[PDB]
Amino acid sequence: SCPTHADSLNNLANIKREQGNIEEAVRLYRKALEVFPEFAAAHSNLASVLQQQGKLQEALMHYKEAIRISPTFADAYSNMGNTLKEMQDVQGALQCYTRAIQINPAFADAHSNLASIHKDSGNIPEAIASYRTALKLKPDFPDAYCNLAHCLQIVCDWTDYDERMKKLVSIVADQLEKNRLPSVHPHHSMLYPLSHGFRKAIAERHGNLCLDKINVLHKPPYEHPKDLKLSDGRLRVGYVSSDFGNHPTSHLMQSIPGMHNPDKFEVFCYALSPDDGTNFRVKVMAEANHFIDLSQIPCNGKAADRIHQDGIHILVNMNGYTKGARNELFALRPAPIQAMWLGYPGTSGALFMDYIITDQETSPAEVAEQYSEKLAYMPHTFFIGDHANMFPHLKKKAVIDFKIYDNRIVLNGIDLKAFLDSLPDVKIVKMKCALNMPVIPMNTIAEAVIEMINRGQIQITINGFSISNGLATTQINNKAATGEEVPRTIIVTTRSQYGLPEDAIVYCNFNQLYKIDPSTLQMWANILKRVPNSVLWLLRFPAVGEPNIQQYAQNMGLPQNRIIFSPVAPKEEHVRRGQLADVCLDTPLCNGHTTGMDVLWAGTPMVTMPGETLASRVAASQLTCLGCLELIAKNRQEYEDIAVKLGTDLEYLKKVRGKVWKQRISSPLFNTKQYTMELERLYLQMWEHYAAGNKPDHMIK
Numbered sequence: 001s002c003p004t005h006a007d008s009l010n011n012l013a014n015i016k017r018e019q020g021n022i023e024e025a026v027r028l029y030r031k032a033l034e035v036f037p038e039f040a041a042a043h044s045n046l047a048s049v050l051q052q053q054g055k056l057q058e059a060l061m062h063y064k065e066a067i068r069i070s071p072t073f074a075d076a077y078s079n080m081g082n083t084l085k086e087m088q089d090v091q092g093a094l095q096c097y098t099r100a101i102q103i104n105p106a107f108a109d110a111h112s113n114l115a116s117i118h119k120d121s122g123n124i125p126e127a128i129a130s131y132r133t134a135l136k137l138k139p140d141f142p143d144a145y146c147n148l149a150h151c152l153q154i155v156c157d158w159t160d161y162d163e164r165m166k167k168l169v170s171i172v173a174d175q176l177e178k179n180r181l182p183s184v185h186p187h188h189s190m191l192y193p194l195s196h197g198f199r200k201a202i203a204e205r206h207g208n209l210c211l212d213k214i215n216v217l218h219k220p221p222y223e224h225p226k227d228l229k230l231s232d233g234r235l236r237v238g239y240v241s242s243d244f245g246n247h248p249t250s251h252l253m254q255s256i257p258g259m260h261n262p263d264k265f266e267v268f269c270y271a272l273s274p275d276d277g278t279n280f281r282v283k284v285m286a287e288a289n290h291f292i293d294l295s296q297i298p299c300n301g302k303a304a305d306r307i308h309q310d311g312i313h314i315l316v317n318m319n320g321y322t323k324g325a326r327n328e329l330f331a332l333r334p335a336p337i338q339a340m341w342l343g344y345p346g347t348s349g350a351l352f353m354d355y356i357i358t359d360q361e362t363s364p365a366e367v368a369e370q371y372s373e374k375l376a377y378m379p380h381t382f383f384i385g386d387h388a389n390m391f392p393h394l395k396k397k398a399v400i401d402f403k404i405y406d407n408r409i410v411l412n413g414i415d416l417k418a419f420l421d422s423l424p425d426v427k428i429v430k431m432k433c434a435l436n437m438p439v440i441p442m443n444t445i446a447e448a449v450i451e452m453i454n455r456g457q458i459q460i461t462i463n464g465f466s467i468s469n470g471l472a473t474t475q476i477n478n479k480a481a482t483g484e485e486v487p488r489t490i491i492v493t494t495r496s497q498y499g500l501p502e503d504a505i506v507y508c509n510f511n512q513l514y515k516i517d518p519s520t521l522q523m524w525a526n527i528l529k530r531v532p533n534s535v536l537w538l539l540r541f542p543a544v545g546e547p548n549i550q551q552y553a554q555n556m557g558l559p560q561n562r563i564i565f566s567p568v569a570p571k572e573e574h575v576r577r578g579q580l581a582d583v584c585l586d587t588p589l590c591n592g593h594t595t596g597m598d599v600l601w602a603g604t605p606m607v608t609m610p611g612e613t614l615a616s617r618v619a620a621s622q623l624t625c626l627g628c629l630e631l632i633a634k635n636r637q638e639y640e641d642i643a644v645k646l647g648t649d650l651e652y653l654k655k656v657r658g659k660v661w662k663q664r665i666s667s668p669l670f671n672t673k674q675y676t677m678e679l680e681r682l683y684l685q686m687w688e689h690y691a692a693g694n695k696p697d698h699m700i701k
């Protein structure tokens, strides 16, 4: 019952904790509490190691004790908050934060945590405010600084940008050198000028967080299959994602599990999130050989057991370091071969991952040192899209002529042909080097369509055919607006709907604004200045970034009307309105990935400049697969030149649009059947290699 004794125990456990011996520390803390139970400091310490080990429910118990013993303990309130946050009790976490701030107005950590809550809930201006307050109270505060840095990045606040990037590097450099966990998230490292080494290290450090959380389970190594006998000659492939539902990932690969060859493969889909009722989740469950809902097995131990009992040979990680990931499953290694795929544009940096599925364009062998996994190449690009299936109505288009452009007033529809054949005089414009663009002339009918658009009407009727206003698809068929269903009506899309000029080159970029940096905007200003008859089309993504971007745009000499903003739209509208643009200017810092497949499906030429990171090379990979090497810039000047040519030489622009318009169908880019077959071949290399007794090595065909 001696406090001086218990205190000595506490001091000793801190020692064991800094040596990285988490397990012995817990034993010492527990000894201190057995001696002197009213020991606030011991409860608080034991709580944060229990939190590290993912034993949240029990850590919460000890934080509460620490609070009862010392009601002035703002540090304990703030930590207990983090625990509740991790338990998905954000209401209770918020209470813990504000209460710490009430007790100690100058307690920086609580302000930083309060900010994070806002940052997660999309309230960026509020998060930015609380971070700034935390930094005023505690100027040397890496976590706060780096998160604020990301907030500023999100809304395009480039105040002291150059100096900011320099301090981020200095922070990561100092933390890595002192063997601490870097304040920069692995997913965000792709945005800052860190060395390839630093990025991988960050990733690794983060991957190790899973280890304390699984070591606690005390699980033995799993015995993996050495053959395919128990699976009747079938390779068992497990796809693990928290995004089987209305999420970009499903928009890319939902068709794949059903395209696997049942003779050689047995597809197991492991959902980390619960059913959201969308068709995406419905399709994958219906076409996968087995669909397992792991969201109902919260214990990573019991969940990995499930995977192992299914007998998976190749386990595929589609989350990496994104929201909803449960990499503890991979840390446990329930499969002999575990690969990174599609969902995360980076390296896990962790031992528990063997391959990263990619291609020679995205990840050339000379930069194989930015990954920790062995490279596994797909023949063309590793990127795939399900556009051919989700938006087949965009396979053909038709225009209306107002005195011929291919992107001023556009009609799409599965029944578009039958409607045209009902019209009196339709001119059929040929595309050279089997393809044509029907042109509806300015008639009484063509006037009624314009009319519906100008008056903001939902829809009209022409010769019994249903003509829909592209702005109101969600009132006509919400499932069709989200991409879950193919539209059953003919849709009209115009530049007037979005305030785009009818007589100008339209450069577009439909990415989140965080992908844009000062150097990129400067590049785009140079283009707009060299092509005076043009505008830049961007999205309010988020809206608060618009005033910031516009502000810098005018510092570069661009009048307001040069950049035109639109609101974020439903999937189908988003993809469809891409048809309106003449050219898409890709962001070099982090390319449009899904967004890249989007603009390409509309037959819109995309100009890109491949960097060194995987994230910055996906666009070029897409383009080479498509067959457009002349849209790939080697440097900033060639990028600006390529865009200035497409903008000023109208025949060259017509020729390239015609290329993308044809090749998006003829190339293997949107071919999910071929892609799946290539993927299967890649798997079999992986398996043959492992069965032959070898350890993972690069897979270049």
Ligand SMILES: O=c1ccn([C@@H]2O[C@H](COP(=O)(O)OP(=O)(O)O)[C@@H](O)[C@H]2O)c(=O)[nH]1
Pocket: 248, 251, 510, 512, 539, 567, 568, 569, 570, 571, 572, 574, 591, 592, 593, 594, 595, 596, 598
């Ligand atoms: O106006 C828009 C703009 C974007 N998107 C969708 O939002 C997602 C963007 O997510 P992400 O930032 O991850 O795109 P990526 O980085 O993969 O290109 C994509 O599915 C787009 O199709 C949309 O539905 N409407």
